[PDB]
């Protein structure tokens, strides 16, 4: 089977046995923000006559799940299989001897509901209008045990038998629909927040990607996977083209997460970013000295002299796209080809002898990228510099100028735009908390017409319980 998708995640078994250790957490919320209501009646009782009962204000009082499991189901679900779940129950009863008038005042006894559920929810996942959506119509629950304790072991009678001949099924059957309702919408909540979170990365001011599925996810019994369109945004305009073709052979089952992203998709950042007036850079004096230097160069050397000249607090550099960059994946790498242009001025004390040089060029890059110590690390495979119109704007220029400027370009240019870019890209990861999760040895693989992300998460024991806390 094909797919039509520009971002295609793969989410295999091992990282859903990671998440499964925090399944006992979310299964607690799902019971905490159910609304039990109260059980009344007016029943007759054997020899007590009319009796005016009611359990009012059902609270939990203990939680307690046992073990949890997850278990991927071919071209279907989700199957989250909890046991022995020891819920604690909290309220009042009130009844009042109505026939039995003479037996003296209606009573307020404090009970106790003691249960042992077992618990099955087969979650299907659907594309609802491009967003991820939960469904577990099937939902099972198993009751071991469901007793009711009353203060002091008080009993007339009549409340033993009340509960288990009517209280019992009733109870049980309110409690599935309160907690297969409960867990239901937190299992949405995840995923529209996940989906939310997900776009909050991928998208820095007018510049937004648009992560629509383009269909319903598949299970598997290795890996669950969403495809998404991948169309970058700019200023709320997006273009529908058609979308390259994906085969779910070029992804694993070994690791965690998966991602898969067409070259197009780079296309369209490049299209966006250029656009934006992004792909700029401008240098003046203390910083180009500190930038020469921090290519290890000392701008008191006999070469650094006749260039800057001996003025450098007022020379400055200029480097900007005049086209939309060609970002192109091969197997070798990424590789960039841009139009650049680098405009380079050294004031002199007379306009005449300051030196002004306009170098029009096109600048190849294959760069390679890697992620390590929550930094973003894009290093120069091969390059290659094809002058267009190498232009001087004053008597004061040769071709030795020419070829010294040229080679700053290359030596430093290209290092350092390359530098700022790993910067500037971690700097996003961090502001979107990428920085937040333990990413277990990532690979960054580069393949003709598509860029791999392979990686195994640690999940940080917190970052749930932060997300968790924000629902009332
Ligand atoms: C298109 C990618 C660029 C790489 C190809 C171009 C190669 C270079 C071409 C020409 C060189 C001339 C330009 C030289 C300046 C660039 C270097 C730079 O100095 O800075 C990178 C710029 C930001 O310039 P600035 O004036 O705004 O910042 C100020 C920058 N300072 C703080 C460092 C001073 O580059 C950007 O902005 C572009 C990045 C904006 C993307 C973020 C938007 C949200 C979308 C996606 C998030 C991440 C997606 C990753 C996963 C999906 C795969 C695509
Ligand atoms: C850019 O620099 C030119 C000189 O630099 C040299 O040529 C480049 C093409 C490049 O190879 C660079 O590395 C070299 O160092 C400037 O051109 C010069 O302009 C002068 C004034 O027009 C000119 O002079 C005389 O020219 C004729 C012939 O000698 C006389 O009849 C006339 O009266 C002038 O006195 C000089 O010859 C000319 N050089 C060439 C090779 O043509 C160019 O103007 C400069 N650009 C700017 C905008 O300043
Ligand atoms: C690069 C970024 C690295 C980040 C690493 C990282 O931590 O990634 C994980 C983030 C959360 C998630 C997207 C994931 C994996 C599985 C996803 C989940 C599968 C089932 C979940 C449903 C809502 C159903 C829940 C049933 C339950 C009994 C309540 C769903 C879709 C929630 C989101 C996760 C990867
Ligand atoms: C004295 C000197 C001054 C003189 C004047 C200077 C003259 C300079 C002249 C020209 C400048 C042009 C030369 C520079 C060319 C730049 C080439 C250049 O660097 O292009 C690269 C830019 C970044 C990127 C798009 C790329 C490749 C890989 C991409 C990345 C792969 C994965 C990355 C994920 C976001 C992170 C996954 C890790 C995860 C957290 C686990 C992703 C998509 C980030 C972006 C890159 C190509
Ligand atoms: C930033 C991760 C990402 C999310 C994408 O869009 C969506 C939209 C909806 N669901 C997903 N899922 C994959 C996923 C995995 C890991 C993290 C993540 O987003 C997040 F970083 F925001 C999370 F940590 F909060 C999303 C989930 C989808 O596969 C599923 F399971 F619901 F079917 N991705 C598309 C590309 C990328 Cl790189
Ligand atoms: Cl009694």
């Given at each position: 089977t094909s797919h039509e998708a520009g971002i295609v995640c793969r989410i295999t078994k091992p990282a859903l046995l990671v998440l499964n250790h925090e399944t006992a957490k979310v299964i607690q919320t799902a019971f905490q923000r159910?609304?039990?209501?109260?059980?009344?009646?007016?029943?007759?009782?054997?020899?007590?006559?009319?009796?005016?009962?009611?359990?009012?204000?059902?609270?939990?009082?203990?939680?307690?799940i046992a073990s949890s499991q997850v278990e991927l189901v071919e071209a279907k679900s989700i199957d989250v299989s909890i046991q022995d779940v020891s819920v604690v129950f909290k309220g009042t009863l009130k009844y009042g001897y109505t026939t039995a008038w003479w037996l003296g005042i209606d009573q307020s006894i404090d009970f106790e509901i003691d249960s042992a559920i077992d618990l099955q929810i087969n979650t299907q996942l659907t594309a609802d209008s491009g967003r991820?959506?939960?469904?577990?119509?099937?939902?099972?629950?198993?009751?071991?045990?469901?007793?009711?304790?009353?203060?002091?072991?008080?009993?007339?009678?009549?409340?033993?038998?009340?509960?288990?001949?009517?209280?019992?099924?009733?109870?049980?059957?309110?409690?599935?629909?309160?907690?297969?309702?409960?867990?239901?919408?937190?299992?949405?909540?995840?995923?529209?927040?996940v989906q939310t979170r997900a776009a909050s990365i991928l998208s820095d001011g007018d510049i937004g990607v648009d992560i629509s599925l383009t269909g319903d996810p598949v299970i598997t019994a290795?890996?669950?996977?969403?495809?998404?369109?991948?169309?970058?945004?700019?200023?709320?305009?997006?273009?529908?083209?058609?979308?390259?073709?994906?085969?779910?052979?070029?992804?694993?089952?070994?690791?965690?997460?998966?991602?898969?992203?067409?070259?197009?998709?780079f296309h369209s950042l490049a299209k966006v970013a250029f656009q934006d007036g992004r792909l700029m850079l401008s240098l003046m004096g203390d910083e180009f000295k500190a930038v020469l230097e921090t290519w290890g160069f000392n701008t008191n050397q006999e070469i650094f002299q006749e260039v800057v000249g001996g003025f450098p607090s007022q020379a400055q550099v200029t480097v900007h796209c005049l086209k939309m960059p060609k970002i192109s994946c091969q197997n070798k790498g990424?590789?960039?080809?841009?139009?650049?242009?680098?405009?380079?001025?050294?004031?002199?004390?007379?306009?005449?002898?300051?030196?002004?040089?306009?170098?029009?060029?096109?600048?190849?890059?294959?760069?390679?990228?890697?992620?390590?110590?929550?930094?973003?690390?894009?290093?120069?495979?091969?390059?290659?510099?094809?002058?267009?119109?190498?232009?001087?704007?004053?008597?004061?220029?040769?071709e030795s100028?020419?070829?010294?400027?040229?080679?700053?370009?290359?030596?430093?240019?290209?290092?350092?735009?390359?530098?700022?870019?790993?910067?500037?890209?971690?700097?996003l990861m961090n502001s979107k908390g990428v920085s937040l999760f333990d990413i277990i040895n990532?690979?960054?693989?580069?393949?003709?017409?598509?860029?791999?992300?392979?990686?195994?998460?640690?999940?940080?024991?917190?970052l749930l319980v932060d997300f968790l806390q924000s629902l009332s």
């Open positions: 159910a609304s039990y209501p109260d059980i009344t009646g007016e029943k007759a009782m054997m020899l007590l006559g009319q009796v005016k009962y009611g359990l009012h204000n059902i609270q939990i009082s203990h939680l307690s991820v959506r939960t469904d577990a119509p099937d939902c099972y629950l198993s009751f071991h045990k469901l007793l009711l304790h009353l203060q002091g072991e008080r009993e007339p009678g009549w409340i033993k038998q009340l509960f288990t001949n009517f209280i019992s099924f009733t109870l049980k059957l309110v409690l599935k629909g309160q907690i297969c309702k409960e867990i239901n919408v937190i299992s949405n909540i995840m995923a529209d927040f290795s890996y669950l996977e969403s495809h998404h369109k991948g169309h970058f945004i700019y200023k709320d305009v997006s273009e529908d083209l058609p979308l390259p073709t994906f085969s779910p052979t070029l992804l694993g089952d070994s690791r965690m997460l998966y991602f898969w992203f067409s070259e197009r998709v990424v590789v960039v080809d841009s139009s650049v242009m680098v405009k380079f001025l050294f004031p002199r004390p007379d306009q005449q002898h300051s030196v002004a040089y306009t170098f029009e060029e096109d600048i190849v890059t294959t760069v390679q990228a890697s992620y390590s110590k929550k930094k973003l690390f894009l290093s120069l495979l091969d390059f290659q510099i094809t002058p267009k119109t190498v232009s001087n704007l004053t008597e004061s220029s040769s100028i020419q070829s010294f400027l040229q080679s700053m370009i290359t030596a430093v240019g290209i290092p350092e735009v390359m530098s700022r870019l790993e910067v500037v890209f971690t700097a990532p690979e960054i693989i580069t393949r003709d017409g598509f860029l791999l992300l392979q990686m195994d998460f640690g999940f940080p024991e917190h």
